[model samples]
Target: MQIFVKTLTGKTITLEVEPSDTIENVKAKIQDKEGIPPDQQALIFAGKQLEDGRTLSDYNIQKESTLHLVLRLRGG
Candidate 1:
């Protein structure tokens, strides 16, 4: 199975794995691949947000999903 991490800036990343991986796992890869911290980012599937506690298996992510990485705001 393959997962595509499509960034807002038009950069895409490919990863090999099954649907058993957690959101945290991919987030780690995102950071490792481009030095983007997980805390400053989050996952999106079908325009819905995915939290770190969830797994791909928990959603319909195995059906050729394109994981969207969106910018997150912090600091009040």
Candidate 2:
């Protein structure tokens, strides 16, 4: 299945993967695309921090879903 991922930076990226792909996988891919390190990345969706090891299934995401992956960062 394919899904559209919207980045915190307002970039949209589309990925085609199995429905079995977890939300963490999406986060990891977002990190990879944005050149943000994993430790600094935050998994946020629908105004919540997605728990680790949670799959799209956990959120009831569909195969053709389009979701926003908000990256969390700290600033002075």
Candidate 3:
């Protein structure tokens, strides 16, 4: 299935993913298109923050679920 990851700035990345795919797997895929490091990527769905070690199934996410990507604050 595919998921949509969006940003407040109107950037959206659509990725091909699976229920067994972990957040890191999703993050890396987001990086492939957005150029943000996996560690810096944060996925949120239904107001819940996703864990990198947790799979999509764990979050109960499926096709057409839209995740909001909030970038971590970079150090000065």
Candidate 4:
């Protein structure tokens, strides 16, 4: 399945993934493509936070759906 991801910087990225791919899997791709760490990435769909262990299909995510990627704040 292909989906669009919107970054916190307002950048849109296209991702190809399997329906069984978990949010953590998606985050790993994001980290690879955007240099954002998986732990610092938050996946949001339908205005809800996507759990790392949950598959895309579990959240009913479909092709061409847009997911919001929020960057977490890291402090010392």
Candidate 5:
């Protein structure tokens, strides 16, 4: 299965992974590919925050789903 991911850098990226891939696995992969820290990011699916340690299995992420990864901007 394939999934569409949007990065904090405003770049839309696509990945081909198994349908059983968990959200944590996607997070780690995004961190590795985008060089961003998972701690500073949040996963938004269907307009909700995916709590830490949750998986796509838990969230019911389906094939060809477009998961928007919006980064939490913090600064003064």
Candidate 6:
């Protein structure tokens, strides 16, 4: 399954993944491609936050599913 992802920085990327893939798996890929740490990524799909342990299918994510990646803010 392929999906589209947009980052808070306005960067967009396409991802090819299995429906059984976990959100953490997708975050790992995004981290690799975008240099964002998986722990710092908050993936939102279908207007809901996607949990790392949840599968894409669990959220009914399919082809062209749009995911928003928000970077977690860290403060001193």
Clashes of each: 0, 0, 0, 0, 1, 0
For candidate 5, the per-residue lDDT at 59 reads: 79
State the lDDT at 57 in candidate 6.
Answer: 95
Consecutive 10-residue window with the lowest summed lDDT within model 4: 67-76
Local error of candidate 6 at residue 24 (angstroms): 0.7
Candidate 3 local lDDT, 1-76, one digit each (tens): 9999999889878999999999999998998888998877778999999988899999999999999998886799
TM-score of each: 0.87, 0.67, 0.92, 0.92, 0.77, 0.93
- 1 or 3: which has the higher TM-score? 3
Worst 10 residues of 3 by lDDT: 34-43
lDDT of 6 by residue, 1-76 (tens): 7998987778898899999999999999887787888988889986899998989999999988899989786887
Assess candidate 1 and give its TM-score to the true structure. 0.87
Off by over 4 Å in 4: none
- Candidate 3 Cα outliers beyond 4 Å, as residue runs: none
Better of 2 and 3 by lDDT: 3
Could you tell me the TM-score of candidate 6?
A: 0.93
Predicted candidate 4 versus true structure: per-residue lDDT over 8-74, tens digit per residue: 7779989998999989989998888888888888889989999999899999999999999887777
Error of 4 at 8 (Å): 2.4
Model 1: lDDT equals: 0.84
How far does residue 16 in candidate 4 sit from its true spot (Å)?
0.3
Candidate 1 residue lDDT tens string, 1-76: 8888898898998877578888888788788888988898878888898988788889779856788998887769
Ranking by lDDT: 3, 4, 6, 1, 5, 2
| RMSD list, candidates in order | 1.5, 2.4, 1.0, 1.0, 2.2, 1.0
